[PDB]
């Protein structure tokens, strides 16, 4: 209701870099808020696409940002009569970026990997990898839990079980408050999908350069399955964390599986051991129910609610005609040991091909009335199709059906305005939480300040 749309700040990256594909607020040990931006098609130092990360400091005027530096050199290690190989060309560094304390974790989901042993090989495949940075010290670490040294043949002999060769780890990422990094790997287990968890501290302390295959003892990966419902489900396309079992001493994981059960889609709430606690099923096939997942208490009762996005949902219209507009589903958490029932509210897009629900950002309390608010992206919405982000204020009954405010893309056609979003952080120190919106198509980020 109170994001100023006239007073904007534009941060810009280089052409064709997809600067703004992903972003997050980052806070240094001093307390100063900055904006980390991911640019998955940034040219490396030898004019080949490697992707890149930028750390933007808060300015009213905005402008260009400094490049958070990472090692873009490929690595080879001949060890144990094998040849380990990393390939960073077209790895998409900054396809996702997340911050926690004084660390930043930017991932390259399509970083390739191979192992050669005489005439045989593991196969050159996109295991993915995450680069971890600590700006104020300069420390760097990596985490690539899907790398292996198993030759192609052995997977065939074992019916492709425990096949992590195509994980694309870091496709999605989130960090718990304790400092456990959780990665989405929708290619995991032959495109079932998987999650890999590891304490940020333990990643840093077990990493050394040039090793390539190393053990992070405290890590916890999810499991493979031979249940056809999970096949090609992309479980981990999106990921999130929250509190859904009443016990504050444990953390629950929210996983999006948008093509689960023959493209029906699903989202699951799980414990830290990856035992399923609940499963929400998609309403309509190919709608990509699970593309987005957001956790926030919107009705002021202290229990986290779940928001799921299905951006390709087709709405029914006059004379049996369908219209792709996109849909967001709200699930308010009830009291005690009781499952998440049917949706408390359905929000549906209005523009054809608008992809409403492509991103869902908890805004915190935008108007400081007590109830938390959210932002929902329609990257190709608005009458022109340039994009649109819609604010929804929270209330006792959940959310409002009608949006409180509508942000129209200031960038030209194709920008994907709203493809990325983040809030709940006060960047200018005025008491109200703000919103950063990414337009990778236009290589920019728009910062909207909340005002009284």
């Amino acid at each position, epitope marked *: 209701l109170n994001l100023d749309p006239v007073q904007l700040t534009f941060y810009a990256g280089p052409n064709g870099s997809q600067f703004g594909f992903s972003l997050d607020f980052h806070k240094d040990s001093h307390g100063r808020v900055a904006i980390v931006v991911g640019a998955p098609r940034t040219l490396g130092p030898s004019q080949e696409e490697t992707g890149g990360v930028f750390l933007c400091p808060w300015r009213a005027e905005g402008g260009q940002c400094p490049s958070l530096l990472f090692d873009l050199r490929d690595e080879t*290690r*001949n*060890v*144990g*009569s094998q040849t380990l190989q990393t390939f960073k060309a077209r790895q998409g560094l900054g396809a996702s970026v997340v911050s926690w304390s004084d660390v930043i974790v930017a991932c390259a989901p399509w970083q390739h990997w191979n192992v050669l042993e005489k005439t045989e090989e593991a196969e050159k495949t996109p295991v993915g990898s995450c680069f971890l940075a600590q700006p104020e010290s300069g420390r760097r670490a990596e985490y690539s839990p899907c790398r292996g*040294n198993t030759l192609s043949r052995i997977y065939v002999e074992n019916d492709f079980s425990w096949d992590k060769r195509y994980c694309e780890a870091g496709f999605s990422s989130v960090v718990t408050q304790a400092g456990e990094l959780v990665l989405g790997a929708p290619g995991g287990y032959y495109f079932l999908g998987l999650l890999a968890q590891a304490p940020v501290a333990d990643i840093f302390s*077990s*990493y*050394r350069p*040039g*090793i390539l*295959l*190393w*053990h992070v*003892s405290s890590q916890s990966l999810s499991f493979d399955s031979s249940n056809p419902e999970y096949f090609d489900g992309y479980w981990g396309y999106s990921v999130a964390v929250g509190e859904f079992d009443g016990d504050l001493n444990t953390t629950e994981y929210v996983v999006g599986a948008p093509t689960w059960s023959w493209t029906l889609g699903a989202v699951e709430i799980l414990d830290s051991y990856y035992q399923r606690l609940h499963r929400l099923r998609g309403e309509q096939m190919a709608s990509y129910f699970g593309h987005s997942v957001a956790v926030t208490d919107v009705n002021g009762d202290g229990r986290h609610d779940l928001l799921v996005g299905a951006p390709l949902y087709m709405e029914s219209r006059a004379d049996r005609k369908l219209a792709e507009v996109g849909r967001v589903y709200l699930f308010l958490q009830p009291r005690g040991p009781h499952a998440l029932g049917a949706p408390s509210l359905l929000l549906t897009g209005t523009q054809l091909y608008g992809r409403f629900g492509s991103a869902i950002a908890p805004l915190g309390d935008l108007d400081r009335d007590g109830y938390n608010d959210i932002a929902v992206a329609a990257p190709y919405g608005g009458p022109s199709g340039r994009g649109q982000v819609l604010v929804f204020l929270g209330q006792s009954e959940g959310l409002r059906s009608r949006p409180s405010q509508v942000l129209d893309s200031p960038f030209p056609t194709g920008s994907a305005f709203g493809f990325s979003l983040r809030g709940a952080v006060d960047i200018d120190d005025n008491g109200y939480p703000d919103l950063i919106v990414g337009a990778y198509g236009a290589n920019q980020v728009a910062v909207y300040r909340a005002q009284p």
Partner: antibody
Amino acid sequence: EVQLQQSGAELVKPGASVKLSCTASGFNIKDTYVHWVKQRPEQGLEWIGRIDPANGYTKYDPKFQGKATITADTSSNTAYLQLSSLTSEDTAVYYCVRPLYDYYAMDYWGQGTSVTVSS
Amino acid sequence: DILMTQSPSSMSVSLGDTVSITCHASQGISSNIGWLQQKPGKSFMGLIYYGTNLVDGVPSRFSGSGSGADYSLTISSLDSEDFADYYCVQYAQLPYTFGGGTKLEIKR
């Protein structure tokens, strides 16, 4: 605290077999490769082989192929070295070894198990 | 099989000395080398992995160096606890091979 606890000293007869054990403590035996190494005063340290207890696959130095059989059991969290056709050359101290971080390294070691072949 | 020739086999040294143990491979092993310590009667403790990286808990005074086929362990300012045997192991190729060993001895 990562620790490899090996079974006690063995007094075995030539021609017989013996099976040494190495039990994980403060970690799971499937976490990494587990190796077995031979030490003798004159000849020194010799690498016997390894196992990946997650899947059972093993490797051996051709010198110990046939004599040595490494196995592991994740239920009991233990790796084993079995030596058949015991000769006087098998009198040695035997260690199980695992890496700290690097997959291929040899960092953590058991206290060793003494085997004396004698009639 | 790669041969690991370690040198010297023994040295007589004093507390406070800085000493070095070399270890030469029969072919290049691109830092895929470990350093081990065995104290009298005791078992083994890992000192260095992958050429230069100290194992967790190992004191600052130990360091590794070298490249290709020639590497060195250096102990700076010998503590009385450092009078022991030391070995190198390579893991560039299977089978893993060890060095002969170097025994640090108390000079008098």
